[PDB]
From a paper:
X-ray crystal structures of various PEF proteins including ALG-2 have common features: the presence of eight α-helices and dimer formation via paired EF5s that are positioned in anti-parallel orientation. Binding of Ca2+ (or Zn2+) to EF3 enables the side chain of R125, present in the loop connecting EF3 and EF4, to move enough to make a primary hydrophobic pocket (Pocket 1) accessible to the critical PPYP motif found in Alix.
Surprisingly, however, the F122A mutant (ALG-2F122A, Phe substituted with Ala) exhibited an unexpected hyperactivity in Alix-binding. In this non-canonical EF-hand coordination, zinc ion was bonded to OD1D171 and OD2D173 in place of OD1D169 and OW175, respectively, at the x and -y positions. A wall formed by Gly121Phe122 in des3-20ALG-2/Ca2+-bound (green) disappeared in des3-23ALG-2ΔGF122/Ca2+-bound, and a surface structure represented by G123 was also changed (magenta) The continuous wall formed by 121-GFG-123 was maintained in Zn2+-bound des3-20ALG-2F122A. Comparison of the estimated angles formed by α4 (entering helix) and α5 (exiting helix) in EF3 between the structures of wild-type ALG-2 (θ = 54.5°) and des3-20ALG-2F122A (θ = 62.6°) in the Zn2+-bound forms indicates inclination of α5 by 8.1° away from α4, resulting in a shift in the position of the Cα atom of F122A for 2.0 Å. This more open conformation of the EF-hand motif in F122A mutant maintains distances or causes a small increase in distances between the Cα atoms of Y124 and T162 (facing Pocket 1) (WT, 9.9 Å; F122A, 10.1 Å) and between the Cα atoms of F122/A122 and Q159 (facing Pocket 2) (WT, 10.2 Å; F122A, 10.7 Å).
Residue numbers in the entry:
A (entry chain A), B (entry chain A): 25 to 191
Write the structure that this text describes.
């Protein structure tokens, strides 16, 4: 699509043909007038950078745009008060949606862990990072939960291996 | 001691009265002609920074110097070929020293995880970071190993809590 090319051209400010980490950061809003989470940008870029330039070309940027737009849909679906910030109540709705069974008190930990703003509400950039991290911890857990009952038994050495495979 | 003050003055290059992250990095050698591990410096400084300036004053720097010198002793004690780099064989000696019972194959993972050089040998700056991380993972594990048999049983929610308490 040619519309994607206009976005690419606007984001690719040095006109190198490759959008770097700083450039994608500048083209993204988190609705709080602070710079979009550098770690989130780092995650998104390395997720679509097939070569290793620390950036994306147009061919890969189409995947990046797909990815970011998908998150905007999901964020807004679970943004019911339309506050532009997912609250404790809504974060539960989001996770409960995807089949997570977690105690109310544990959502306090998730919010304190991902919210770079103090407000106890999660912005779009932090929300993406949060879910990416959560997905990875679930995938790892499932390797060790061989009977699918939400419990694992691990030795000290198996535990270290588990923690190190997070990267 | 006045000798510590001469070191402080030489390290504190902007003469601010506080040694920052960049300044401590420059005053430290890892014996490989690459910059001392920024994460290691970050760990050491935040370990002795009682206030929050992202640096250390003379009162705290004495603790920093104590800490770094302690690591130099330990590093050299386990540096038997005097290579200036702890090898797989020596890393086992180091860990076995402090009572760790880990398989030979798992030391491959530790080395691949901490060695920023490719050589499969751990430099001084990476060695400090490695052990700090290992100590923290052991402390956390011990909270969940209530009967002290080197095994833990945890639910998915307990697992997430465990991972998040690493920080
Ligand atoms: Zn560019
Ligand atoms: Zn909302
Ligand atoms: Zn089971
Ligand atoms: Zn200074
Ligand atoms: Zn050696
Ligand atoms: Zn037991």
């Amino acid at each position: 699509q040619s519309f994607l090319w206009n976005v690419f051209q606007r984001v690719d400010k040095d006109r190198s043909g490759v959008i770097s980490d700083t450039e994608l950061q500048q083209a993204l809003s988190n609705g709080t007038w602070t710079p979009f989470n550098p770690v989130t940008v780092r995650s998104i870029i390395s997720m679509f950078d097939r070569e290793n330039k620390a950036g994306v070309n147009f061919s890969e940027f189409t995947g990046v745009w797909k990815y970011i737009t998908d998150w905007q849909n999901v964020f807004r679906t679970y943004d019911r008060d339309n506050s532009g910030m997912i609250d404790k109540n809504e974060l539960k709705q989001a996770l409960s949606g995807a089949g997570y069974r977690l105690s109310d008190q544990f959502h306090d930990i998730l919010i304190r862990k991902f919210d770079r703003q103090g407000r106890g509400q999660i912005a779009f950039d932090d929300f993406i990072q949060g879910c990416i991290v959560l997905q990875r911890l679930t995938d790892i857990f499932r390797r060790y939960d061989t009977d699918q009952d939400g419990w694992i038994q691990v030795s000290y050495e198996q535990y270290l291996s588990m923690v190190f495979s997070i990267v």
